[PDB]
C-alpha cells in the first residue's frame, strides 16, 4: 500500500498555479526536484503574469508533502506516497488573521517520471493596506509542525497548522491552515495514526533572474509516533 519505490532517487517536479486574490489574477510556474529519502525539495517559481500581487511567502504552503522523509518505523503512515501514482486532491482554507483567506484545490500526481502539482487558488476579503496586499511581509520563512490525522469519515487525511509570517515592523502575521487530502484512485491508501511533519523552508533569489520569482529549499521529516504503536 506504501509507494516508497516511486520515490527512489531524485524526482523532477513541476508546479502550476492559477490564482485570483481580490480580483487580482495571476499565474505561477515552478520546476525543480525532490529527494524523499533525504526529505529535501529544491524549486524555483516564476510569476508568469508580471509582479505577483501577493507576497511570495504567502504562497509557500500552496506551491508536495509526498517528498517528506518518513522514518524507518513510520512507513505505514505515509498517506501522500500511498496515493501515487494516481495522486491526491489537496484542498485548504487559510485564514490570515485580521485579513482575508485563501481557498485552494490542487491535484498532485505522477505524470511519468515527473511529480506534478496543479493548483487553483481563490483569495477574498483582503484589506488593500493590510500586510498581504500591502506587501509588508519579510522575504523569509520559519519552521513549523504540520499535524496530520486520518479522516474519520472518508479515506483521506485532515491536516492543520499555523504559519508565522514575520512583518517589516517586527510583528507577526498568522495564517491558520486547514487542509484535507483525498485520493484520486480508488485503491487502498495508508490512513495514518496522528503525527506531524517537521517543516523548514528557506527562500532566496537567483541574482541572474529578472522575472518575479522565488527560489525555495525545504527539508521535511515526519515524526511523533512511537515504534510499533
Ligand atoms: Na504496492
Ligand atoms: Na489591489
Ligand atoms: Zn525508528
Ligand atoms: Zn498505530
Author numbering: 1 to 3, 5 to 64, 68 to 233
What does the paper say about this structure?
Using directed evolution, enhanced green fluorescent protein (EGFP) was observed to tolerate residue deletion across the breadth of the protein, particularly within short and long loops, helical elements, and at the termini of strands. Only correctly folded EGFP variants bestow the fluorescent green phenotype on E. coli.
The overall structures of EGFP and EGFPG4Δ are very similar with backbone and all atom root-mean-square deviations of 0.6 Å and 1.2 Å, respectively, suggesting that deletion of G4 is having a subtle effect on structure, predominantly at the local level. Deletion of G4 results in a significant local rearrangement of residues in the 310 helix and the helix itself. K3 rotates by ∼120° around the axis of the 310 helix to reside at the position previously occupied by G4. The carboxylate group of E5 is now within electrostatic bonding distance (2.7 Å) of the NZ amine group of K79 in the adjacent 310 helix, which in turn is within hydrogen bond distance of the backbone carbonyl group of Y74. This new polar bond network absent from EGFP now links different secondary structure elements in EGFPG4Δ. Folding analysis revealed that EGFPG4Δ retained more structure upon unfolding and refolded with almost 100% efficiency but at the expense of thermodynamic stability.
